[PDB]
Write a protein that binds this ligand. Structure first.
Ligand SMILES: O=c1ccn([C@@H]2O[C@H](COP(=O)(O)OP(=O)(O)OP(=O)(O)O)[C@@H](O)[C@H]2O)c(=O)[nH]1
Length: 585
């Protein structure tokens, strides 16, 4: 593509004061012609960066200088306080008139919602070699996070629901593989792959090389999602297609928080009720939490207030210097972002989806100033809130119960350490446990008589903590529709005649109505896969069998003829699916 002369001009340019990338061409011949294919390739790699980053590599270096100087300084705001527009959501396990109104209002709005899934990470930090959306939400059905989100979206928004997945070099191919393998048919899905950015070996922003001598690359952060969307087409801009088709909201979700399918309808309803352009999904936060705080900020004493997320580390540092006259006052943002689409698009078009950047290098020492590993510039998807002036827009937050926040983000060992400090585990074990409990709390809210012990049923991480799983009740999207309390009530029309023992397992797939049941064991009930077909009705059912059990993965663990996978090891237990009754037709 690019010319021999253009590559020469760029090389020369990069060697000028303020750029100083001479180290990249150490011992090269005078002109491009004389350069070998390998050298020609590196210059090409530098050159093509322009169609990936605003201003290309030259501006990247300049930005690096600015940010590196900036981050060497002390972060501080001239003003910081509670956001004006904070709204408390009613409990998810109480079927009050208010909860009902918000759920049904939000559910209608789901019909005009665009969904965006941010999925550019592996679960390595968890102990998981594959993509995080391939993690199961729970091992009873093994439904992946990916299918979980996609089927819900297609349920509430129909088959042609507009859906974006942002991937990366790490997750992209595998994401496409998973889509194919699960036979997911999503006509209006757009998979947008973020590009990695160059790295700085040092504080002078000298570009880093890898082991082969090629330019080193690292992720630019989830902030890329806005740029990717701004540049996506269907020759018509993606966002224009959405707008013209009548879509009115857009929501952004993380890769392993199943709670989003519960919070979203509520947030949508509240966004409409309080005319919110941007609505941060929040929870009350404990000061000892790697979660950001939603704050009304003012960077300089002359600026306007901005409503935006303030990262935990920053808020810590910020506080000690400028104190001016059991959770944090400010809400904790879980990064489920809800927008009025028209407002989002306006800001998008104005900024080209570019959001403020930062750099956060890891040093070898406090004093030696040397990097431990090459740094790169990053961006956060939530920082788009900075483009929404308080004069033109209403940016606020909705506060939910902490229980509705169920990320799978820590390894078993990390969770052990965390639990000891009295903090949340947020590992695969507690994620799975929380999902089962969530179903139970929702079901009880409509009158299902679920009596079960709160005692843990298995201990993980060398006996560090326990979780319980049973009773296990999982209804698919054809059965439970949107998951609203009203939708659940359709499955259980006369709840008081349904008696699910605390040790039982109930799996429901398809169009099923359960009127009366006594279950002591494991049961799967299957109905029509078509949401519009006549339902399989269960009445006067009695099922007794050995059902399922759970036990910890033993420390002894090693050995051939083994069936333990990473999925098992990252949660520290295994379901034994001993027996299972099936009711079809
Ligand atoms: O460059 C990135 C970084 C993060 N993310 C998205 O970050 C959410 C939170 O990302 P975090 O930054 O909070 O965690 P992480 O990336 O270290 O690990 P993952 O979450 O990727 O597993 C997930 O949606 C993650 O895929 C991206 O999509 N791209």
């Amino acid at each position: 593509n690019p010319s021999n002369s253009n590559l020469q001009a760029l090389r020369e340019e990069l060697c000028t004061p303020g750029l100083d990338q001479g180290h990249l061409f150490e011992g090269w011949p005078e002109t491009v012609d004389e350069c070998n294919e390998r050298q020609i390739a590196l210059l090409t790699d530098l050159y093509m960066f322009s169609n990936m980053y605003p201003g290309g590599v030259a501006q990247y270096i300049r930005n690096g200088h600015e940010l590196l100087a900036r981050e060497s300084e002390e972060v501080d705001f001239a003003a910081l306080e509670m956001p004006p527009l904070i709204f408390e959501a009613p409990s998810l396990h109480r079927r009050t008139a208010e909860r009902t109104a918000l759920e049904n209002a939000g559910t209608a709005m789901l019909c005009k919602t665009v969904f965006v899934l941010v999925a550019g990470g592996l679960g390595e930090r968890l102990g998981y070699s594959s993509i995080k959306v391939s993690l199961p939400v729970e091992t009873a059905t093994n439904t992946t996070y990916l299918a979980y989100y996609l089927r819900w979206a297609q349920r509430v928004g129909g088959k042609e629901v507009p859906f974006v997945i942002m991937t990366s070099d790490d997750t992209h191919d595998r994401t496409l593989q998973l889509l194919r393998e699960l036979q997911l048919e999503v006509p209006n899905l757009h998979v947008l792959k973020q590009g990695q950015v160059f790295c700085f070996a040092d504080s002078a922003a000298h570009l880093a090389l890898d082991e082969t001598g090629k330019l080193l690359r690292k992720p630019h952060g989830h902030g890329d999602v806005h740029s990717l969307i701004y540049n996506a087409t269907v020759a018509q801009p993606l966002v224009n297609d959405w707008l013209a088709a009548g879509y009115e909201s857009i929501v952004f979700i993380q890769d392993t928080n199943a709670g989003a399918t519960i919070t979203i309808p509520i947030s949508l309803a509240l966004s409409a009720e309080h005319s919110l352009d941007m609505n941060f999904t929040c929870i009350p936060r404990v000061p000892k939490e790697p979660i950001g705080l939603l704050c009304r900020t003012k960077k300089n004493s002359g600026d306007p207030w901005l409503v935006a997320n303030v990262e935990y580390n920053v808020f810590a540092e910020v506080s000690r210097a400028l104190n001016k006259d059991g959770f944090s006052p400010f809400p904790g943002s879980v990064n489920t972002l809800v927008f009025k689409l028209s407002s989002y698009v306006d800001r998008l078009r104005e900024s080209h989806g570019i959001v403020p950047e930062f750099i956060n290098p890891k040093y070898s020492d406090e004093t030696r100033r040397s990097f431990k590993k090459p740094a790169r510039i990053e961006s956060l998807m939530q920082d788009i809130a900075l483009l929404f002036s308080e004069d033109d827009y209403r940016v606020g937050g909705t506060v939910f119960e902490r229980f509705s926040y169920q990320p799978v983000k820590n390894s078993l060992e990390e969770a052990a350490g965390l639990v000891a400090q009295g903090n949340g585990a947020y590992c695969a074990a507690t994620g799975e446990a929380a999902f089962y409990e969530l179903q139970r709390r929702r079901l009880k809210a409509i009158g299902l008589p679920l009596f079960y012990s709160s005692q843990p049923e298995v201990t993980v991480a060398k006996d560090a903590f326990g979780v319980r799983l049973f009773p296990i009740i999982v209804l698919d999207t054809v059965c439970a529709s949107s998951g609203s309390l009203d939708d659940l009530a359709r499955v259980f029309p006369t709840p008081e005649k349904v008696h699910i023992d605390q040790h039982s397992t109930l799996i429901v797939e398809g169009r099923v109505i359960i009127e009366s049941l006594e279950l002591y064991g494991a049961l799967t009930i299957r109905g029509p896969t078509d949401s519009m077909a006549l339902p399989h009705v269960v009445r006067n059912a009695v099922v007794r069998n050995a059902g399922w059990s759970v036990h910890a993965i033993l420390s002894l663990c090693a050995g051939r003829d083994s069936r333990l996978s990473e999925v098992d090891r990252i949660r520290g237990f295994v379901l034994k699916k001993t027996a299972m009754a099936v009711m079809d037709c």
